[model samples]
Target chain A: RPRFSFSIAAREGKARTGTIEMKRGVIRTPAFMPVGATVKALKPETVRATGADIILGNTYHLMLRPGAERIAKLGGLHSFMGWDRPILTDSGGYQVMSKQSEEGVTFMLSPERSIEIQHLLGSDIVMAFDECTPYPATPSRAASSMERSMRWAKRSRDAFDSRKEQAENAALFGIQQGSVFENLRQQSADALAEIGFDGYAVGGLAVGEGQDEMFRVLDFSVPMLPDDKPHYLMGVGKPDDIVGAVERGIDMFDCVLPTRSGRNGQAFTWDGPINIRNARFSEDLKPLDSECHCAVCQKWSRAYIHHLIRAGEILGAMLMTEHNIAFYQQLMQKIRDSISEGRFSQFAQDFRARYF
Target chain B: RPRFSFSIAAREGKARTGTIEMKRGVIRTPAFMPVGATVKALKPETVRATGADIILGNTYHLMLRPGAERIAKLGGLHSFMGWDRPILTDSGGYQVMSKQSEEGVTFMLSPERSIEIQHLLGSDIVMAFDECTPYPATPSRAASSMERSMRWAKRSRDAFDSRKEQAENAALFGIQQGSVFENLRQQSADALAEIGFDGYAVGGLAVGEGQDEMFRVLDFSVPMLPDDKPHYLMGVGKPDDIVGAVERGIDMFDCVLPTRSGRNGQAFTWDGPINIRNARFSEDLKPLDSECHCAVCQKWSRAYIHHLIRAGEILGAMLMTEHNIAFYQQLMQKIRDSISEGRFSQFAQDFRARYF
Candidate 1:
């Protein structure tokens, strides 16, 4: 039997609250996974304390710095970073566009190589190798990319199946890509579904395509994927973006906005994001947010954090990132609660009005 | 009556373990104080977790960035940084040498200004203003500096007495300075004792003078101070240096070595210090120190920390600093335990042999 399985317990319109049971742990659906790139900012214990059920790790960075085989020998990414919960590792496919290319094909991660690296790293969820399909591609260009991704998805499945022992303990997720073309997205979803996988992901949405356009893509793209399994929205997003995606059919999300913006002195709050380095906060003795119940808000003032941020202190990044991750996790809990209570639409509307 | 008092609870030869009772908390002697400059790096709670009895905050950095007056308005340093333990803040006398001057007299700091700033910061232990007599000075220069510091010590006592209400909850410590001269050191100690403060600090020794010279100074200097009160060895040194100082009757110490060196990828252990950036640690699966009982040592491997240090990860600094501080605190505990059991000399000898 497969070690990974998801089941919905509650639904409010298109939004649903569910749970995904993995060998490592149970992850509540509509979950937000914090990025722990290079084991840089937050420790896994701190991430767990922030109410996260899972976290995301980068394939390319980890492979380059620590090496996948070394991590496997040292007892996998879980033991390496001290995170026991489910970790979802992205395929190196997205990094290919930004990384160095040897000859012309270096950036293109082979499906077999990506799957083998993920298996070696030993994360709970491994994504299929697929191009991130840039934001402004033409329909013809997007079609070609989508077709290539479908082929890679099939290759990933074969590679994943080759490690039968690993497949029993972990799961492979297929990526649906078509940029913003509705027909191409349908074709990508149909091809991935035909090949069969544990879960499906709607990729290439949050890459500079404004929230409205991203939502428009999700509106058509998410439903085309299977409803029986989990639906993950990759590399998304700000607060409003997440709520909007969940209102469509996205069951999971991974983003670096919360972690990245936090390190830069920006803080997420129920009202909106606030820049801690602003001089206006220099004398403000109150916490970052009076409504925030996180340890940072309870113990630190805006003025103190303002000083740390202006001085470029590491603890500044630590506190801000810690709070941001907690905020994201809290938002996910509220989303799940709203869905269980059949008030997800109202919750999303209220959140957008206040947050945006 | 003074609100602070020190009482020795155990002794073995010249090495003793004791406690300093204050309004905020009690600090065990032979304690290591972690530097929290600019209110950055480790949080007070994390420091407390590392078994530190007290911590050190800089008047220079705090005054420049957050401003001493601003922190007072925010409820003082303890509230500002969420540290409830006893905190000892140095007078900005050391900082005056490095910062820009208003007039021709660049390195001189008024005793009134130093005492007033310490009062405003509201820490449990406040250091009196005095010149940190520079190393490599002529006998004439050292004597002149010592005489000037003696005059400032009196002014510091007067200023501390002026704030009668603030003095009730806090303690002031006078610094003894005379470079490395024995008679000059005796003269400085006599002057401080006559002025009368809560504790005495042997300053001017760790200013790039080698360990042998520093120990020579301490051997003559520490004995001249009042044995009834606590003896602080300011900015004094490596694990072996601390062990040696304890043997010569020093009671407390504060330095930026552990935190600063950890940020630079240096890990301290009973087996001496190891640089995490070395190529040899890339595949070493052992912890930073196999015998260390710290959480970092218990959870992470040298190979993982090696990767983090090479990649310049913040967590690299966090874990390394955390482990180093814990190691220091544990060293202090072992020192105290040995002193109580009447085996301090043996403990010191064994520690030096292993650490060096």
Candidate 2:
């Protein structure tokens, strides 16, 4: 596939199972791409082993360290990361980085620069440069933010199209930023579809609006985008959150929950997230998750992991990160499986019942 | 292979290649054991993938964290670490530690405590407790330290003997520590030989005594020990250092250079050690060592690694550490290969030729 394409395999209500085929690899949805090249410093082999079909790299950080120029000279994100799979690169639109302008956002960068960096990164799914509206913004603030984002998205699209060779190899995804208001979200979504893209992302949530609001936004935000294309939920979320969004028609997701949380001792199990450092685990002769079949859980016990964490052992982080990724992958697989079996709504309810 | 046994396969002067067979696994000498339970957080599989057949655990530190009691309760060091191979445990003999007395030295410990710790760690080879003589000690001070160490060695031996089951499964190695004084070295070696051990170690070197001085000490020290058993040069070192030590009749070896340095930015290549952070590596599209067959060097480029290092990417440390351990393992294999081929002397010359 020289160009990216998303084909739904099955659906139960708004929940669905599908594949996003790219030149590098096929991404399965409701797909969960681990964030960051390292994903808590795991090798690409192990990351892929966890059923990860794709990974997301932050263009903001990439442009900072391992600078995009360096990554380009050394091939690209896939080569540099040793993950020979599809990569979804954010458009340096991550707020806290750069200021929006009519000339495009600047962190000493422009929409051209952002798109160019993502192009050099060899992004299979390139996100558009857009301002993320503040989560608690009023309708007026959100409208202003979403309107500016609409203009910036067009700039990104123009710059992205200018690289004809890059466009031939990769598909661009435009980000829709409209805070939580249904009208603003539709406005933002309308502007993105007008510009057109291979895919679309319902951006500007998971910004601490709480799960209820994020889910609420996804309910209205997802339908306004093209059902023929993929819907990405940026920087999203816990397993339950993912389930809820998938129920609301999300096709793609990326988050550092498992990757980062695992580093500090928490593990997301079917039973919910548990901190391995809890004193009760010191003598518990059980796996991280007895029901899970990840390499870490299959081989190591909670008692052993507890010992590692208490000792401040690096292996603690290593094993925890591994188990968490495996869990997420398994969860994603279950999500996809449930949709294919036409029981996603039932599986999700049970998942939340046990998880919450 | 249940019983610990060392058998020499071939020899070239003092340098020889052989095997130490045990129930867990057979280790080829002169083996290089990466220090730290983590090996800079490389997974047990990757560590083993680097051709690592054995690893050494520090007793003092092990007692401090991941306490030996916890390891024993969790089913010993092998399971705790998930490294199913031979492990040699130190005797808690490191100074900056405890005071020596008639009963035993105290780090709130005794010879019984030290050996028991190693036993609980499921040590394939247990080291006898002996104080590392301070470098630059006066001859009289050296005698005092050596005699005391000699006495402590006997105490350790006696404590080790009392545990019939541990002795049946594991072997003990006594340390020969007398600083650089030749007579004292012989006396300490003689005392260790008198006590009898599965092996012997020339301790107290690599203690700020430069390579030349360490080599000088090993020359006189090795001849005094029994040639039939393994001669471990405690904390024995660099590629060139290992070459010289193996030539002086040492067999087993362990250290932190490759594991620790690799955690930073340095890599031990066949051409010698190189810092991947150097500006020169930024555009060098070649592998870490084109000739090396390790996983890291086979696929990753110097330019990519340089970019990772500059970016402070964890993958940089991950790749560098993997490559360094691979280089060490290859060097060990070459050492064993040269010895078996009866060309170790010539090989060492060529090794130092490029390494220096």
Candidate 3:
């Protein structure tokens, strides 16, 4: 087993505080991992500027573009991307599933095959082979997908364990998939626990299922996992969603929404999102937020950003991206701080009232 | 004179170093002004981020979009754009002429109409009316246009001085417009000087004339301009072009190439330019330049930027723009420092050898 370990520092009702020790560094519980698709061009220092300890890289895309073998030849993704921080790479399982639809056979590859590819990629925290259950699913469809993921889970674990070179250096997480059916959720949880992996991930929840249904699923499924390991939430969520999940004892999250929305001129602010592209904002003399300490906020304003977008300038997007990452990191910081201080419930409530 | 004065500090052959001290701030010699259209959104800090002491706002666009009166009503251009830095409003002369020829009229306004609009805009450095001599012009056509611009320059000065509030706070720059004709160039310069404005701009070059022709035109025309006033080269471009123009005693310039080329995934480098959209850089992990100390170069790699461009990610443009702006500003710094130290002759030769 890798030297990966999770320790709970404190608990306030169901909101628990802890830390996960990984190869590169320690991740405090309820940490948000910013997404850097190809390589860490955002830079470890820029990522650090946003107060992030770790950033997530994609196995599917990296493997396709630069190829896993090339990265391995180049001394792994860390050296290739110039990021020497802890990185969690998803098994290409998500990409395989992401490429598929309900009718099936959307792509040529299977989830199990994708997992083997990620193993070759030298992922630190490998995810199990699973389909991201589409929302508004029939219970029967959800069950079969869950069963398929569980069977693939065993294959993924076997494949991971067989790669002796990477086995000791990586931790594999079993994914729980249910598509919002409570019984299906319970069954998925029970199956994942039985399959036995280094950690458990609450996947398939943030697949546009809306917040209420996803939170309810977490409420029913979180306690079934082992308490000694990390609880990862794959491809999870907005600020409110993350806080809600963290309150239910979730530990890790990765999302592309913050970065994506940023480039589109949507800024997540304390007073809700402000689109920097709005014409009214073109001459409005105020920073994106007066309260936020992000470099973008500290240095630029809504007016400046508006002109950048109108002028089709890139500095606008750069400033906005920096701001979004900072906002997300600050959100995680607040969540962790609240959990550690036994104020998770209050903090979450206040955050949602403003953000939502 | 509103406590504003333009001074020369040193001269190296044709090149000169000077400062233009204005009410809001000082514009360092041989500065590159970032382009701000109509409502100027590149915040004072973001402008300062480029190490620019002043920014250019477009009178034609602003007058057409937000209406000049509206901007003036909102506490003038400076307060409206959240930029207190000196703003040199291009006397919608370029836009008026840019609207002519094959494209049909981009705007409906004439030179007479634009002068009224500039007053309502309340710009600090108002440009005089001039026709941007369309490329490939006959000598007869060029002379006719130059004469018309001279006529408009007188009318513009009269209108500029008529507005007591504007005259007290702002300075008018008479534009010289001759297309590659030595006698015509000198004649335009003498005509504009006779009208006696606060400053003069060499406005006809950089449209399509190659660098040699542009250098030829500047050699004859720039020397005739009033030494006590500022000399601006409107719409002058590229890194090498800037260095050459600075070496030719031009004090200010603005261009869309840096911002536009950035959006198109082109990066400026000392060795040459790199188009990030090209697939050859898909795995090249080198920085944009080993010598550049910009934040973008220090943190991002060619591979990551290439990936962003390939993926059509916004970060690609954002990163590229940041790098280009940094490149321009750094180039300005190098040019200014070289001139101050009387090493411009060596700097110009070495820069041209590498940049060209």
- Identify the runs in model 1 with alpha carbons over 4 angstroms from their true place: A37-39, A99-105, B37-40, B99-108
Cα lDDT tens digits, model 2, B62-178, are 787668887788788788767888888888767425356756665466777889999888898898877787778899988998898888789889988899988888889999888
DockQ metric for all predictions? 0.70, 0.51, 0.17
| DockQ measured for candidate 2 | 0.51
Q: What is the C-alpha local distance difference test score of candidate 2? A: 0.84
What ranking emerges by DockQ with the best candidate at the front? 1, 2, 3
Question: Which 10-residue window of candidate 2 chain A scores lowest in summed lDDT?
Answer: A93-102
Task: Provide i-RMS per model in Å.
Answer: 1.9, 2.4, 5.5
Q: For model 1, how does the per-residue alpha-carbon lDDT over A1-356 read when each residue is reduced to its tens digit?
A: 23988999999777889999998899999999888734347788888998989888898888776788888888888878888889999987787665322112374457888889899899789999888788799999899888888888888899989998778898889999999999999999999999999999998888888988999989988889999889999988888888988999899999888889998999999989999999999989888876777888888889888988898889999899989988999899999999999999988889888876
The global Cα lDDT (0 to 1) of model 1 is 0.86
Q: Which tens-of-lDDT digit does each residue in A142-219 have in candidate 3?
A: 888888778777777887778786578777889888888878878888888887888899878777778887888889
C-alpha lDDT values of all predictions: 0.86, 0.84, 0.76
Estimate how well candidate 3 is docked, as a DockQ score.
Answer: 0.17
| Candidate 3 clash figure, as a count | 1
**In model 1, what is the error at residue B306, expressed in angstroms?**
1.1
What TM-score does chain A of model 1 get? Answer: 0.96
